[PDB]
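In the laboratory, one determines a bound structure by crystallizing the protein with its ligand and collecting diffraction data. In a computational setting the workflow is compressed into a single prediction: the sequence and the ligand go in, and a structural description comes out. We illustrate the idea with bromide ion.
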Amino acid sequence: KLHLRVVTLIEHPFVFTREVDDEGLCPAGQLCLDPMTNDSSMLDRLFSSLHSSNDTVPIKFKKCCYGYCIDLLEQLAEDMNFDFDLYIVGDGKYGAWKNGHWTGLVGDLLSGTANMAVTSFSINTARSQVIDFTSPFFSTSLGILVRTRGTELSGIHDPKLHHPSQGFRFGTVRESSAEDYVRQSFPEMHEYMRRYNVPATPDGVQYLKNDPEKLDAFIMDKALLDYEVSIDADCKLLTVGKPFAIEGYGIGLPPNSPLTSNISELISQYKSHGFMDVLHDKWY
Ligand SMILES: [Br-]
Ligand SMILES: [Cl-]
Ligand SMILES: [Cl-]
Ligand SMILES: [Cl-]
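The predicted complex, in structure-token form:
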């Protein structure tokens, strides 16, 4: 029985968090930590405490994690016969190459702080050079969220994005695969966006959707934007334009991990036996 430390990132509907219940448990999820650290020794120490009868973990660090990726992770743990500790990535980022290192989930895999990363994690070329990805369990285009009767765009090649009018505000999530795509394909656009990019997907959605409006368009994974559109009560949001930058979501492991093939096998079986469809129906 292997024991894996798993890093995740809260992104609806793939992973959500809520507080633990009265008896310190998670009847409909998995106990996780939200410790704001990338120090492997601190995590060891915290999970050691969490498992003991002398649990002195600050409550501010304890959460219940639930969602599509947590259901996936539980099934993998049962089929591969491993148990796991689960924590939320300290910097809240998926990961990018910045100032000579990798940040976010990619960084924790490369430092050995996490054994595996499970969330809506995009497989792209740059990350593929440094970490392993399993077979994908989901696929998504990038998308562009706007208000109804608001900004209209043809897709990522719209001149409004490339020769922006004064005060036209559009951004993406910092240190995501969407930022890496814009940075590598449209350097001048990437520069323009810097002042408008946001730390996390919910921030971009809030800035576009809520008043006072802070963004005119928000670019991020279409699967995530479509979820927000589907729960839009006032039906005042939409996604626009042609597809672009289609990527799979995969589980991340260190390069050349011996676990990758076994997890890929299971993901492929889950897909071919309708489990992905069940998870999609459950969470979307
Ligand atoms: Br729960
Ligand atoms: Cl897929
Ligand atoms: Cl209307
Ligand atoms: Cl940030």
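The pocket of bromide ion (ligand 1) is lined by residues 26-29, 64, 66 (CB under 6 Å). Keep in mind that any predicted model is a hypothesis to be tested, not a measurement.
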